[PDB]
């Protein structure tokens, strides 16, 4: 990696993106982005930060970053360990779970969900599976 691939089916109410992998032993950060490849908009930007232990997420829309959402109930990533991330897309929001526990919801900023057709993953991670 960096991993950058086409979603074989674009996002919509009820669509899923599953990330399985291993956060590096000496990791500091990694990113999984849900892109609208046509305008280069990042509708969903999940950025777990191992060093400060914060799950950051934002949207990069019209060449400009929005307001940041950090609110978590627990930090589900730990260096040297395997994680599974399920990203579920609902009508009004994304729902993200990590390792069988609910992590966060994220209201849709990029409203035209069918235009989200790209997945990008980079950072201090070892990618096992994208589904």
UniProtKB/Swiss-Prot annotation:
<feature type="binding site">
    <location>
        <begin position="65"/>
        <end position="71"/>
    </location>
    <ligand>
        <name>a beta-D-galactoside</name>
    </ligand>
</feature>
<comment type="function">
    <text>Beta-galactoside-binding lectin that acts as a sensor of membrane damage caused by infection and restricts the proliferation of infecting pathogens by targeting them for autophagy. Detects membrane rupture by binding beta-galactoside ligands located on the lumenal side of the endosome membrane; these ligands becoming exposed to the cytoplasm following rupture. Restricts infection by initiating autophagy via interaction with CALCOCO2/NDP52. Required to restrict infection of bacterial invasion such as S.typhimurium. Also required to restrict infection of Picornaviridae viruses.</text>
</comment>
<comment type="subunit">
    <text>Homodimer. Interacts with CALCOCO2/NDP52. Interacts with PDPN; the interaction is glycosylation-dependent; may participate in connection of the lymphatic endothelium to the surrounding extracellular matrix.</text>
</comment>
<protein>
    <recommendedName>
        <fullName>Galectin-8</fullName>
    </recommendedName>
</protein>
<feature type="domain" description="Galectin 2">
    <location>
        <begin position="3"/>
        <end position="131"/>
    </location>
</feature>
């Amino acid at each position: 990696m960096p991993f950058a691939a086409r979603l074989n089916t674009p996002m919509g109410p009820g669509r899923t993106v599953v990330v399985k992998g291993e956060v590096n032993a000496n990791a500091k950060s990694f990113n999984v982005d849900l892109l609208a490849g046509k305008s280069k908009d990042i509708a969903l930007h999940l950025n777990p930060r191992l060093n400060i232990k914060a799950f950051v997420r934002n949207s990069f829309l019209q060449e400009s970053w929005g307001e940041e959402e950090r609110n978590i109930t627990s930090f589900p990533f730990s260096p040297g360990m395997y994680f599974e991330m399920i990203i579920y897309c609902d009508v009004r929001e994304f729902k993200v779970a990590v390792n069988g526990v609910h992590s966060l919801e994220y209201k849709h900023r990029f409203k035209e969900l069918s235009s989200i057709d790209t997945l990008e993953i980079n950072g201090d991670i070892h990618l096992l599976e994208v589904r």
